[PDB]
Amino acid sequence: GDIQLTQSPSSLSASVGDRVTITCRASQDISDYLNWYQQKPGKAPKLLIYAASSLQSGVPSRFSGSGSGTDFTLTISNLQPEDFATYYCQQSYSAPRTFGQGTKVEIK
Amino acid sequence: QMQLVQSGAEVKKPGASVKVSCKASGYTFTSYAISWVRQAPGQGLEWMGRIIPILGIANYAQKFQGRVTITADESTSTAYMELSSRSEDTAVYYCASGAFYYGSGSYPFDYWGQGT
Amino acid sequence: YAWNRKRISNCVADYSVLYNSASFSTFKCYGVSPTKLNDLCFTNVYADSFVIRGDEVRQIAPGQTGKIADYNYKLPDDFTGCVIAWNSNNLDSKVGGNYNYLYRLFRKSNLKPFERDISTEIYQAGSTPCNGVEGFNCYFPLQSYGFQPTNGVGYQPYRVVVLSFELLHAPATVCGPKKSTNLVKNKCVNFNFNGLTGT
Amino acid sequence: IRGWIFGTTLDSKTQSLLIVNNATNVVIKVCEFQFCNDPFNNCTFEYVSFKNLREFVFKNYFKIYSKHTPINLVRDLPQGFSALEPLVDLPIGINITRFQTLLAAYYVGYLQPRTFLLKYNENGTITDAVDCALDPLSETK
Amino acid sequence: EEQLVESGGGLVQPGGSLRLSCAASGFRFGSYYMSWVRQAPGKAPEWVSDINTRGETTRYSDSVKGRFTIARDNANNTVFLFMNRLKPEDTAVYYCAVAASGDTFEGRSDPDYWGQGTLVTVS
Ligand SMILES: *[C@@H]1O[C@H](CO)[C@@H](O)[C@H](O)[C@H]1NC(C)=O
Ligand SMILES: *[C@@H]1O[C@H](CO)[C@@H](O)[C@H](O)[C@H]1NC(C)=O
Ligand SMILES: *[C@@H]1O[C@H](CO)[C@@H](O)[C@H](O)[C@H]1NC(C)=O
Ligand SMILES: *[C@@H]1O[C@H](CO)[C@@H](O)[C@H](O)[C@H]1NC(C)=O
């Protein structure tokens, strides 16, 4: 039936050059159909990781995607002031096209 | 070229029609399915519809099924809406696209706008 | 996927002129020789105009499978028509990627001969209901063609016209030209004045 | 008044024939058009080509024979003789079992397969015909 | 399965000679047709060479006849083709095709599979 995306944790306070781990899951099995997105207030949304295992062109190697089954992991190193923005989970698995709850990280 | 025009932000009475234009300049057409995502200030992004440019049919979710009607034209390469929402549904639409391939992953690629 | 079908009736066609042109260099015919079908009458002619790659020529063949063969247009075994094609990189292949043409990549069943499917139903092949969205085993099965001037000839666009022939108790509306000869007077000749003949 | 509508079901479900005359031209049409009770697609063939007395013979592909002759001041067919030159030939082969005529006088008869004897002239025009099974004198003739 | 791999082309001056090799896989080679076409600027691909089911009978273009001297190797599944005394207009990508016709009616039954070919430049 309905499919939902759950993101943990929903908020972080990470400093420069930290180890940021985002665990994004769903109510049912997801093979590889999940994406991590960047959205800062005031700019267009930009993709971080598409298909949960591929790096985005124009986006450096500071973001990685791993995991499978129920749990997918967005793994971030080398934080910058341009890196602290809102994390989005975007599914491409099935109906309905639900998105993530939003995870905005800001410098402490 | 890599930009879509943003219409002026409007506040509407309940039961009033709302419009939004998403121009597509350059590139090649009849390849990417145009899409719309509605978000509010302080609220996360949520998808509501896509138009395929091949026949102009509409793909909907559960939330706005039977509420929003959407279409697109390839001559102007622009998608349009008819919708009569209330005052509490004041939110910004973002127009997205992406070459939805078949046999592989089906998700938007690029072309994210700056506003309504 | 949306191959145009046009009924041709009540005219005269010069078939061998197309063969003696040497520009449409595919010319695949079944049933009868190109010279004989020029001097042959038929009730109706159906034309099927579409564009494929340079490698999907094998899919346009009776008894052969494929996405073009089984999901876009199926050729019956009892085929007595002609297939003509040529290279069209001049105005069909364009710089940047010609994504204008489409073809059905998935379907729940193989197409019957002389059948066209243009439905935009999301192809369900799994357990998750599609309900119109794209996702896992939930695809809009009309895959887009891709043409570039730097693409290989096996991936270059060929515009294909398929000729069809049928016969019934209805009279032959279309036929080919009939040769004429200069008349000779005051001689023993062996004439065939229209249908009537004599010496 | 003219004879246009021919067919079997007479309202769709098959191709139907129509012969109309307007201004100074005629229109021949076969379509599965929706027909009214007294009017005045699947189309395969469309084509554009008492003081009077017009005779037409229709039989079966499809054949039409016609002739025109000026007359005046008579209520029945005058006791005159004339041939009927062929006009057209429709190879459409429409399955026809019933025909109608809607909106002057007009007469409708029927045809039977009986042997006739014809008399040609110096120019090749039929001037006199004799039935073979009318009366015993014509049977002798 | 079926695959055509080709080599031998290059940039040769007019009046030169060169070799082209095509090797096929996925199907039986000895009893099948093998054709050569060349693609040059200006489109209109010209069918120029063919070998028959027999290893000796060869069909050439009327424009150049006997120039594309041919061999046949059923064991190696590889075909050698020499060409000599090159014209300057012979710069083309050379394609080696697969069997055509095959109990179909006549009228130049076009081959369904062609190779990716090799560049030959003459200047
Ligand atoms: C009326 O007549 C004109 C020519 O006289 C013809 O072109 C036209 O098709 C006719 N229209 C109808 C409805 O018969
Ligand atoms: C013509 O007749 C066929 C036979 O049933 C039908 O399928 C088709 O819809 C018809 N076309 C029309 C009425 O335009
Ligand atoms: C005409 O219709 C009758 C019955 O409606 C049928 O028996 C006959 O075969 C038909 N003929 C043609 C030529 O369609
Ligand atoms: C035959 O045609 C000629 C041509 O003028 C005519 O004079 C003659 O009367 C015609 N014959 C009959 C029997 O009418």
Side-chain angles (χ1 to χ4, degrees), chain A residues 1-70 72-108, chain B, chain C residues 1-177 180-199, chain D residues 1-12 14-23 26-31 33 35 39-40 42-48 50-75 77-78 80-84 86-99 101-141, chain E:
Chain A
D2 289 341
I3 179 67
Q4 305 298 320
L5 303 181
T6 48
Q7 192 168 182
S8 67
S10 297
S11 184
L12 286 90
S13 186
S15 290
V16 167
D18 288 353
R19 183 83 274 172
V20 177
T21 295
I22 314 293
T23 300
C24 183
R25 324 151 301 281
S27 58
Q28 189 274 331
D29 185 22
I30 311 297
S31 69
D32 272 317
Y33 309 139
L34 194 62
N35 318 297
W36 288 283
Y37 274 36
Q38 195 79 272
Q39 159 72 92
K40 199 183 297 295
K43 77 156 179 53
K46 52 160 301 301
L47 197 144
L48 290 164
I49 291 295
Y50 61 94
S53 58
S54 304
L55 311 176
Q56 163 62 40
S57 176
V59 160
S61 304
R62 303 168 292 182
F63 314 96
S64 173
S66 58
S68 185
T70 317
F72 285 89
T73 296
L74 183 63
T75 302
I76 305 107
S77 73
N78 302 337
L79 274 299
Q80 287 91 21
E82 80 255 15
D83 200 315
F84 307 121
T86 310
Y87 292 165
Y88 269 86
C89 276
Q90 315 287 100
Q91 84 163 1
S92 59
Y93 182 76
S94 66
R97 189 55 60 105
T98 50
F99 289 158
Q101 296 92 2
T103 299
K104 168 72 175 62
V105 63
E106 190 276 331
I107 182 68
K108 205 258 179 182
Chain B
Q1 188 270 329
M2 182 45 257
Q3 187 264 347
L4 59 92
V5 60
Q6 170 184 6
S7 305
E10 296 290 327
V11 55
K12 302 288 192 40
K13 280 73 176 175
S17 176
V18 61
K19 61 100 177 178
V20 56
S21 165
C22 172
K23 62 167 185 59
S25 293
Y27 287 163
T28 178
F29 292 165
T30 72
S31 53
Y32 46 88
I34 203 68
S35 65
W36 294 94
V37 177
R38 185 184 316 198
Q39 64 259 36
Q43 189 40 256
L45 267 73
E46 55 94 20
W47 179 107
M48 68 205 155
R50 299 158 271 170
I51 302 93
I52 193 66
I54 313 302
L55 279 76
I57 81 167
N59 309 143
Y60 292 166
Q62 191 53 254
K63 207 58 69 204
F64 292 100
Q65 198 269 333
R67 182 72 263 171
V68 182
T69 187
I70 59 172
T71 189
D73 203 355
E74 58 97 18
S75 52
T76 183
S77 80
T78 301
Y80 268 74
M81 301 215 168
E82 319 296 314
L83 161 66
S84 44
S85 295
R86 273 83 57 200
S87 285
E88 70 260 19
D89 279 321
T90 296
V92 65
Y93 307 144
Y94 269 44
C95 174
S97 81
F100 274 88
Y101 204 82
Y102 320 113
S104 70
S106 59
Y107 43 70
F109 283 172
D110 49 351
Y111 182 74
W112 286 287
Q114 71 273 11
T116 313
Chain C
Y1 78 99
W3 46 278
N4 194 5
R5 159 153 302 167
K6 185 176 177 68
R7 179 157 162 278
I8 295 91
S9 291
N10 317 283
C11 55
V12 56
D14 310 337
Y15 286 132
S16 59
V17 177
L18 303 179
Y19 182 76
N20 288 352
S21 60
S23 76
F24 292 165
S25 291
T26 301
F27 208 106
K28 189 67 208 84
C29 289
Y30 270 20
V32 65
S33 165
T35 70
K36 314 300 174 291
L37 60 90
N38 189 179
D39 298 316
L40 192 45
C41 297
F42 272 92
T43 72
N44 287 311
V45 163
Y46 298 100
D48 277 356
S49 59
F50 63 92
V51 183
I52 54 172
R53 277 85 163 89
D55 288 331
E56 300 160 334
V57 177
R58 187 214 50 65
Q59 318 207 23
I60 308 299
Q64 301 289 336
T65 70
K67 303 304 182 175
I68 308 302
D70 308 350
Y71 295 162
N72 293 270
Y73 176 70
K74 185 54 182 171
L75 283 72
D77 281 328
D78 43 357
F79 188 66
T80 53
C82 285
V83 184
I84 190 67
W86 68 99
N87 199 356
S88 57
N89 292 316
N90 53 87
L91 277 296
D92 201 280
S93 183
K94 61 187 181 183
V95 176
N98 184 17
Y99 284 160
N100 204 6
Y101 285 85
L102 280 297
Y103 84 100
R104 187 166 289 270
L105 186 49
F106 318 111
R107 207 183 165 262
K108 303 183 195 318
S109 84
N110 286 349
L111 274 186
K112 301 180 56 214
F114 294 160
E115 199 194 351
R116 183 194 300 111
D117 203 359
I118 54 171
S119 70
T120 63
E121 178 188 1
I122 299 302
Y123 180 77
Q124 194 178 301
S127 69
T128 60
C130 310
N131 310 140
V133 304
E134 266 185 77
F136 167 74
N137 270 346
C138 280
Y139 291 162
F140 172 54
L142 276 299
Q143 189 36 255
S144 166
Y145 273 20
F147 292 132
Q148 282 96 345
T150 52
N151 285 359
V153 173
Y155 292 165
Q156 272 172 9
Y158 292 168
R159 304 171 179 179
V160 176
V161 176
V162 177
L163 277 296
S164 295
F165 293 99
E166 73 176 3
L167 73 165
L168 286 165
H169 297 331
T173 71
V174 287
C175 197
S180 311
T181 313
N182 200 8
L183 61 84
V184 172
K185 285 194 183 180
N186 295 317
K187 290 294 183 293
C188 290
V189 310
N190 204 351
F191 55 88
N192 209 330
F193 263 104
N194 198 347
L196 179 57
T197 182
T199 305
Chain D
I1 301 300
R2 65 181 65 87
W4 60 88
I5 175 170
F6 286 71
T8 294
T9 72
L10 277 297
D11 206 7
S12 187
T14 177
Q15 286 86 4
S16 174
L17 189 149
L18 188 153
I19 298 170
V20 76
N21 187 5
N22 73 316
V26 292
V27 173
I28 305 299
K29 174 253 280 186
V30 297
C31 296
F33 185 53
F35 293 102
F40 70 102
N42 265 317
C43 300
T44 44
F45 180 80
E46 276 76 58
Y47 164 70
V48 177
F50 296 102
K51 189 59 65 69
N52 290 2
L53 165 63
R54 296 190 153 112
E55 296 93 297
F56 311 93
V57 171
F58 309 102
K59 54 167 302 309
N60 283 130
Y61 291 128
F62 198 79
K63 298 177 179 184
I64 289 174
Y65 305 92
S66 162
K67 195 182 180 293
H68 179 274
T69 298
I71 59 154
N72 53 3
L73 273 301
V74 69
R75 312 288 92 78
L77 308 101
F81 200 72
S82 65
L84 272 154
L87 206 52
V88 297
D89 186 8
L90 274 298
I92 43 178
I94 302 303
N95 212 344
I96 298 160
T97 56
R98 186 195 329 263
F99 86 109
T101 297
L102 277 297
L103 57 92
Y106 69 102
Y107 304 143
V108 166
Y110 279 99
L111 303 190
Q112 289 162 22
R114 299 194 328 206
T115 301
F116 270 28
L117 190 149
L118 296 159
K119 178 197 176 193
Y120 290 68
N121 53 2
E122 64 182 1
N123 298 336
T125 314
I126 296 187
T127 69
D128 214 349
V130 172
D131 184 276
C132 291
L134 187 68
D135 60 356
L137 182 65
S138 295
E139 169 58 43
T140 289
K141 281 181 185 183
Chain E
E1 287 196 2
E2 313 179 3
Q3 193 195 82
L4 286 153
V5 58
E6 60 270 12
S7 298
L11 196 170
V12 190
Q13 295 304 111
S17 297
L18 207 62
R19 187 269 299 164
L20 192 143
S21 284
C22 275
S25 80
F27 61 96
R28 283 184 183 167
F29 162 77
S31 76
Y32 272 10
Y33 279 149
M34 282 315 148
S35 313
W36 286 260
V37 190
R38 41 157 293 185
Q39 193 34 230
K43 304 173 48 56
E46 51 273 26
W47 180 78
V48 290
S49 180
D50 190 20
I51 193 77
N52 262 6
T53 57
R54 316 162 180 185
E56 297 87 4
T57 308
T58 316
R59 180 66 178 87
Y60 294 121
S61 50
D62 286 351
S63 53
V64 293
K65 194 164 180 176
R67 178 163 160 261
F68 292 166
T69 69
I70 194 167
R72 197 94 180 277
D73 212 353
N74 289 354
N76 277 332
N77 205 334
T78 318
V79 191
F80 293 99
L81 190 146
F82 284 170
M83 71 305 288
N84 295 319
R85 84 301 181 271
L86 297 171
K87 280 73 176 175
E89 292 85 54
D90 210 29
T91 184
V93 188
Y94 282 80
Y95 292 160
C96 58
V98 302
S101 293
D103 270 324
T104 69
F105 280 164
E106 61 90 19
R108 189 270 305 278
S109 304
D110 181 76
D112 52 355
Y113 291 166
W114 310 318
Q116 200 63 220
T118 307
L119 287 161
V120 164
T121 304
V122 178
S123 181

